[model samples]
Target: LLNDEDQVVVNKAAVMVHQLSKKEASRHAIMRSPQMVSAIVRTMQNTNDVETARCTAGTLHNLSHHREGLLAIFKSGGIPALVKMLGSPVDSVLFYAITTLHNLLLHQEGAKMAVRLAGGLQKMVALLNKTNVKFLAITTDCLQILAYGNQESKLIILASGGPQALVNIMRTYTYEKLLWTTSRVLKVLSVCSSNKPAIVEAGGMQALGLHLTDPSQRLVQNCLWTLRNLSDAATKQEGMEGLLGTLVQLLGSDDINVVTCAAGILSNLTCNNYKNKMMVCQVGGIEALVRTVLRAGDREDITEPAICALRHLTSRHQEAEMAQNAVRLHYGLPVVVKLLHPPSHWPLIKATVGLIRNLALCPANHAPLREQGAIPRLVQLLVRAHQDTQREGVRMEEIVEGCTGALHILARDVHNRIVIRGLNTIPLFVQLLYSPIENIQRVAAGVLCELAQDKEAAEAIEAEGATAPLTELLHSRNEGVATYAAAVLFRM
Candidate 1:
């Protein structure tokens, strides 16, 4: 209130903010004015101003790393300006800008689209390569972003010798962030089905596998993340043989995400190979997976992985029998029944249902699951759950997620005569024709397909008013739903 200028007049506000703890300064730099940010960026450029800039930029960079802020900065011409500052003589400013961009690129798909549109992808490698310091933090980040970008751009990066660059980065990059970056890069490289072999060609799988046991959880998560991408689809099977060990080991991690990612990877790795099945059983992964399913009660996420690992582990004819008998002994069936107890936890319900459906995908495991009471629980989930719950609980996401192995066993192994003989569960499953979720309806349709092969069961399903709900799903707006629905109708 003294001078007419009346500005609160502490020119050191930004600097003082930094002097506070990281959390406080980080919040201020993020929530404060663009002028504060501009000052922080500008001041950070000076050798004498190194302290202020580093702190301020660290804060602002961290804040702007998110999508809404990255878009704001990009629209406000922040990215181009930052690109210009890359040439700044001060390593501090250069360092902050690089990190800021790196964080911005991490959000995937949507953020990647924006960056590519902002001309970020065009020179990412060139800029990364030009600086001879082999900057692990920035360079590895560029690899991750490029890896997460669109298929065409990833191919471009591959053609640009991106693999070699990543290898070099991996070799010299021993710090945590660098290790984490390598994992993300591997995830991106392997996520797409067609791209896995390309990733293999780039030695992405081998590189990621070598670091699976790194002392860091972040490192392990990233490694499995890449492996999941590679292993998800059938097309990439050529290079997946080497990853079984690390993926199996990850099921034993204390970290839930790592375990989940590992389980999802194994689920994808299920190509019904005998050797792979034997390997999984030999490693006690089957036991670990069964135990995980039994105990993953409160933590719903872990169940999906556990189920998936089980799905993968039971791919062999012999293992399927052992898995079935093991489930009988371990009481894996009761865990699934427990998911529906409270009846409101949708994810758990869906995960349980999906596991059952996948377990049904293998005929060998069918009878044991049937004996274990999987059928009634699945039928109830199909008919009784809400639309969204039913939707999230698809076979893909289920095995991708936990403990519903009973149905998979029934569908995969039980004879049509035996399946038909058990008409008690069909009525409830047939009621899913009324489910709001197309996925559930589609899965219900698949269930009908399996049941319909037995004329008596099909008639019982038809007698239960199944056709109406199945018809609605066939006409659904979602193509995937309609396609699966059609498959169900055709098969049934």
Candidate 2:
């Protein structure tokens, strides 16, 4: 009995069980004995001996390889006991303890909170300061697991200076094994929005961006994702020129995920950041994005971010016109229209439609957009959006909002207005007038206000029973929406 108070007897029993627990049949057999599991946990938790704790956790590390063993340990309070073992100071004991907790984190739903409540993350992160690289590897790996998808755990790691510590390690440690996993953990940490500023404060952006093109795709991927998570991170970094340059090159990467996050990072940089917008074109990102969309085939993962970046890069008064021209220069409009022509993913449509809306802002591209079959694709987009009468109605409404916003822009040209109205979009536009999203209702009403400028389009507007909704919108909350409704109803 390992639970015996005699120290030598307890040590021998613990070692025997540890040896036997190495095999599957023995683990499952041990799982049957609640006394044996409880005895092992008590022996480990109470034992001051290094070998006894190591043997106890070694048995657990072996048992945690399977679900039954995990349940037995978890139910037997092995997690808390193991969590206390995180402070064992012995690498062999600490390794088995951390790996056991890691296995539980991966397979068990409650392990994260259990270990977290037991201060597991605090001690595990503290181990990062250890001189042993092997222990640092397991500690970071376990921290990575804890932070994987759990928001609270990530926050805990952040508060513990994880990103700072991680980048510190990345800078000092040239170990490939450590670098890859440390960066990998940083990537998961960066997923939470709050972690971004902390990460950037620790210069994680530059640290991560430095490895953007590393030979190991896994490492590069984590770097790309971590950098992308700083969504509004247009803050200028060292050799500012090369950062954007590297992202542009990755857009052509054969790996779909690489291309996806590459474009995504570009999207983050360009969102409301004027200099980065111009730099995208300067770094040839505009052309790269256009090419990415052209070659996107059917991967929405690739298409949406690429198209989304194009949408942001071509906005504001800064460089939208030039960016729009470059998109056209690269023969991107045809591909954009082709994407719109099919029943693409909703996110892609939002991006494609939003980009089209921005491209329409330039009077020069209006004809090209029309020449590339923009109006019909837009019409079919509305046709496609309205057909999905499902729970995603709000998403469809946003798409309709973008569609109408684009149409509203395109309608500024007299002939384009006539073509847009001819496509039978008035009914859809009228239907959107009743949407609960005021912005959608507002833009829809704005499009009608534009279309009704024409005598025939005015006739089509009222003929579709838009007058009732238009009149109702006169009492709308947003005065612009009401004013637009007034502009239409006055003409009618």
Q: Clash pairs of candidate 2? A: none
TM-score attained by model 1: 0.52
Candidate 1 local lDDT, 1-492, one digit each (tens): 111111233436555555432564445444343444444444444434445556656655765745545554554445655555556556676677677776666653355555555555545655545433535557567666666656877776666665556655555556777667655765675655555666656656556766778888777777777766765554444444556777777777777778788777676666566566666666666666777766566666677656655655544556766654555456665675565556336655654555554455545445655665665555444334332344623543342122222342355343633643464656655655565555555555655565566666667766777766666777788775576557555544
After best superposition, candidate 2 residue 228: deviation in angstroms?
A: 4.5
Clashes of 2: 0
Candidate 1 deviation (Cα RMSD):
12.1
Local distance difference test, per candidate? 0.58, 0.81
Model 2 residue 105 CA deviation (Å) reads: 10
Worst 10 residues of 1 by lDDT: 1-10
The candidate maximizing lDDT is: 2
